[PDB]
Each structure stands twice: as C-alpha cells, then as structure tokens.
Amino acid sequence: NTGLLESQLSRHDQMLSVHDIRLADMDLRFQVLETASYNGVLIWKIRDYKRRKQEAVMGKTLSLYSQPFYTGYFGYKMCARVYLNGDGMGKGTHLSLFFVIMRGEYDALLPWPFKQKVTLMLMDQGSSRRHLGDAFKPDPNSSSFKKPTGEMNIASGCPVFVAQTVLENGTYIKDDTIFIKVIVDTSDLPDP
C-alpha cells in the first residue's frame, strides 16, 4: 500500500535516527576510558582555548569538566572543573579550577568524607617548565567531601588559581590548547 509502506519506511528512519544517536554517545563513551586514569592523577587536555575562552565571556559555556578519573580500579570517582573566564571571586580576572567528587559505583566501601590530599596545577608547555599549582588537605566539615548523594558533590578549588593576564602572557598557552593536572594523594590510603 502506497500508505502502509509509508509507515514502515518511517518506523525505520525514526529508529535509524536513534542508532545514530546511540552510536553517537558510544563514540564519546570510548574517549572517556581511552583517557581515564586509575592512580589519582589526571591530565586534562583542553584544546581550542581562544574560542572556548571567548565562549566563557559571552557566557554561553562558562565551564567544562574533565574526564572522570579515579584513584584505584575501584576507588573514588572524581574529576575537575574549570572556568576559563573565572567564577565568583575571579570572574573576568582569573581562571578558576576545582576538584570534584562524583557518585562512584564503589563509594559504598570507601571512607567518607573524602580526606586525601589534592594538588591542582596548570602545566607549562614552555621550556622553562615552571608549572603552577596549589594543594590542600580537604577540610572534613564541608559538603564538598561528604559521601556523594547526587551525580557529583559540590565543587572546590581556588577561583583565583592564576591571573588570566599572567596566564595568557606566560609560556602555557600553546597551539591553542593547554594542560591542567590534578594530583590526589593515594599513599596514606591503603588499597585492596
């Protein structure tokens, strides 16, 4: 029927639209693992600064988060978040970056609140290798390190990590891309 076949052709396109959508996700899902780390360390490669920062001012995309990375095959699921233009105390002036804890399929056996030592740092692609970064022993009383309720706990860092100025004028921006690094302590935490 020049009308029945019509339904079938559409039932296929519809479903077709779907796979495409899934195949889409999967195309990404890979990338995560591909770039995930199980030793409490991380290297966030943020490509397309100029554009991506610009967006940060126009306020279309204020921040991006990193790939979830952990601290042992079955430890804390965590990741970073950065505000290129800055958040609150450094908006428009600096760049802000924070460490975040996500709901992890194995949080049920891990200690809480999170207590391990972090260590944030923006790598220097120049030859002077003078990377920048600070660290801290997570204060317990804060809602940032409890036992995760939803997707990811509350952010935490230093809105004024580095001055946009100092940044853009140092040897860190290269090929319109840069590397942030996080370092969660894992020694003072026996493993399985």
Binding site: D87, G88, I154, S156
Partner: peptide, 11 residues
C-alpha cells in the same frame, strides 16, 4: 594557602 573555597553553581 590551604583554606579551600567553592564556586557559583546549584541551579
């Protein structure tokens, strides 16, 4: 430094 601070997001 220490003294850890947060961001502006909870919508």
């Amino acid at each position: 430094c220490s003294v850890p601070i947060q961001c502006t997001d909870k919508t």
